Amino acid sequence: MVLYFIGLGLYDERDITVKGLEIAKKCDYVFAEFYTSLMAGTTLGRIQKLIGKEIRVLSREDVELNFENIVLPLAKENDVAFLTPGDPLVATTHAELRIRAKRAGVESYVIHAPSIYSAVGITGLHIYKFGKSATVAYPMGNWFPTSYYDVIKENAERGLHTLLFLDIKAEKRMYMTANEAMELLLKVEDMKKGGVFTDDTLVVVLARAGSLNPTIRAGYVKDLIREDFGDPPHILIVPGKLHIVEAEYLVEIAGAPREILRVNV
Amino acid sequence: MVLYFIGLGLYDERDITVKGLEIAKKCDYVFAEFYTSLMAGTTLGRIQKLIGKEIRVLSREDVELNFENIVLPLAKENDVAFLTPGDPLVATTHAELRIRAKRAGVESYVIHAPSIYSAVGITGLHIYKFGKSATVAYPMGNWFPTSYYDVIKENAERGLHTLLFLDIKAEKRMYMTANEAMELLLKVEDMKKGGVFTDDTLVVVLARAGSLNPTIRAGYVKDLIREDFGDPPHILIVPGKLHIVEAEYLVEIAGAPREILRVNV
Ligand SMILES: Nc1ncnc2c1ncn2[C@@H]1O[C@H](CSCC[C@H](N)C(=O)O)[C@@H](O)[C@H]1O
Numbered sequence: 001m002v003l004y005f006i007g008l009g010l011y012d013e014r015d016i017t018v019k020g021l022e023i024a025k026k027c028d029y030v031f032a033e034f035y036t037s038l039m040a041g042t043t044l045g046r047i048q049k050l051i052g053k054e055i056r057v058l059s060r061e062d063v064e065l066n067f068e069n070i071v072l073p074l075a076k077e078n079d080v081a082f083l084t085p086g087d088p089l090v091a092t093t094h095a096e097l098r099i100r101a102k103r104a105g106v107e108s109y110v111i112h113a114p115s116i117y118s119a120v121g122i123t124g125l126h127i128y129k130f131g132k133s134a135t136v137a138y139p140m141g142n143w144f145p146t147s148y149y150d151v152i153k154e155n156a157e158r159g160l161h162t163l164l165f166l167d168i169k170a171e172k173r174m175y176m177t178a179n180e181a182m183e184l185l186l187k188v189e190d191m192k193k194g195g196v197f198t199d200d201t202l203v204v205v206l207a208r209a210g211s212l213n214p215t216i217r218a219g220y221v222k223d224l225i226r227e228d229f230g231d232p233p234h235i236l237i238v239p240g241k242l243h244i245v246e247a248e249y250l251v252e253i254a255g256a257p258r259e260i261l262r263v264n265v
Numbered sequence: 266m267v268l269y270f271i272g273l274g275l276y277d278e279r280d281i282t283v284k285g286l287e288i289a290k291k292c293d294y295v296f297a298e299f300y301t302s303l304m305a306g307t308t309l310g311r312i313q314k315l316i317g318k319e320i321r322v323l324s325r326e327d328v329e330l331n332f333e334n335i336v337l338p339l340a341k342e343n344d345v346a347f348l349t350p351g352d353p354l355v356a357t358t359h360a361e362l363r364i365r366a367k368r369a370g371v372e373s374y375v376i377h378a379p380s381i382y383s384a385v386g387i388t389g390l391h392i393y394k395f396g397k398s399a400t401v402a403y404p405m406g407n408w409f410p411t412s413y414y415d416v417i418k419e420n421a422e423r424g425l426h427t428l429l430f431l432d433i434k435a436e437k438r439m440y441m442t443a444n445e446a447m448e449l450l451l452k453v454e455d456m457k458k459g460g461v462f463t464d465d466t467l468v469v470v471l472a473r474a475g476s477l478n479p480t481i482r483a484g485y486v487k488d489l490i491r492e493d494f495g496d497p498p499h500i501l502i503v504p505g506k507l508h509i510v511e512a513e514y515l516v517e518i519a520g521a522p523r524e525i526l527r528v529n530v
């Protein structure tokens with residue numbers, strides 16, 4: 001009678017940790033959600049084959065609305081696993097599900113896996129220099145989210161980097177590209193006119209982290225807004241004040257304009 | 266002709282990903298470093314047996330100073346693996362190593378693994394609310410660092426959480442406990458008098474992340490300062506204002522006092 005929250009990792013089925021695999025293999029029932037993120041290098045079939053268990057995929061409503069009606073009942077008499085892309089508690093509200101587990105009298109354990117939040121280290125930007133993070137959400141009809149723009153502003157004033165998770169509407173197979181993110185930000189700049197995000201802003205794009213050849217690119221918005229970064233998922237990063245060593249990596253590894261090597265001191 | 270940076274994960278030998286284990290097994294040479302951080306729940310012997318190949322350990326000097334003389338030459342005609350605790354390149358210095366690989370004409374790839382940066386999600390604190398991160402280092406001789414205090418102040422002021430890594434003496438396998446960190450902070454507060462860290466400050470301590478049974482505790486400094494958090498490593502977090510769900514998670518999962526539900530939300 002235990003519930004395991006198990007992360008599947010960044011890109012493919014092998015991004016799960018050995019610990020995660022061995023526990024999932026011995027579970028009686030296995031549930032999963034594939035709406036919080038996109039694992040571009042695998043399929044449900046491959047994941048199922050790897051763990052040797054049939055997987056019951058749940059929708060966002062199944063989880064947010066009926067997690068205690070669909071998953072917890074079985075977890076009271078058996079070992080149940082709930083799998084998720086990346087790390088199960090990063091950039092999701094799944095932590096709250098552990099509260100539901102407890103009140104249901106069910107023990108829960110968490111098995112971590114590589115997460116985009118941590119994988120940003122491959123951009124060469126010091127991970128401790130990141131400040132508040134935000135999500136660039138798709139506008140729904142006339143509703144136009146803009147809060148993420150203020151996050152960039154606040155971090156940049158402190159000289160901190162801003163990690164921008166990008167939207168995903170899995171049910172519609174809609175995966176926001178870094179390009180779409182940039183467009184939205186420029187539009188928001190037009191409204192707020194804070195000088196936060198412009199054609200000259202230096203940005204970093206990380207696409208398909210977890211794969212062997214992720215797309216790592218740095219440059220000015222004017223130049224990257226129309227560049228092809230490959231298949232989703234993508235994340236966008238607006239660096240704050242760079243250290244020379246960060247700029248060197250972006251130039252040498254992410255093909256950034258050598259001019260950034262000359263920071264303004 | 267290829268160098269693989271492979272993350273070992275959080276705590277024990279099973280914290281490496283399936284992909285990492287499989288790639289390491291196919292490499293002609295396997296190196297590892299245990300100076301940036303340690304794998305507190307396992308040993309070099311257990312990691313080596315799991316992989317099945319002899320592992321050569323590299324000192325801080327061997328890497329920072331002679332990576333291109335010890336590691337890269339072999340990567341020219343063989344597949345080489347470089348294992349590091351956590352997620353590769355999270356340690357502010359390892360990114361540079363990819364530039365060295367480039368300059369040696371050696372291809373390098375990164376195989377991710379869980380990191381403390383993402384793993385803290387288990388505290389129930391929303392990762393988007395984390396601000397600039399810092400490390401608390403022991404004062405030594407005429408050097409008494411206090412910058413981490415300012416980091417906490419700037420984050421909390423903006424309602425952001427502060428992730429604090431605690432000092433470590435890797436070679437000696439000696440870690441600074443959360444209790445020591447809290448003591449240091451109280452002394453810095455006495456000097457600073459900024460009202461940033463006092464007996465009434467709410468803090469979160471995370472011990473042995475990666476383990477199925479990590480210690481997750483939250484409470485006011487005056488009550489946790491002398492609490493036994495178990496074996497290191499310890500992670501100290503100074504949360505900013507809490508979302509009601511974060512507070513409920515802390516109360517329900519980390520044994521936080523009911524008081525935070527009205528005082529810190
Ligand atoms: N492999 C990957 N490469 C680039 N961005 C990724 C990614 N995986 C996730 N993301 C980013 O994060 C968003 C999901 S938000 C939740 C992330 C997940 N729990 C994790 O720990 O990684 C995606 O829409 C995308 O913008």
Ligand code: NA
Binds near residue numbers: 128130131382
């Ligand atoms: Na951070």
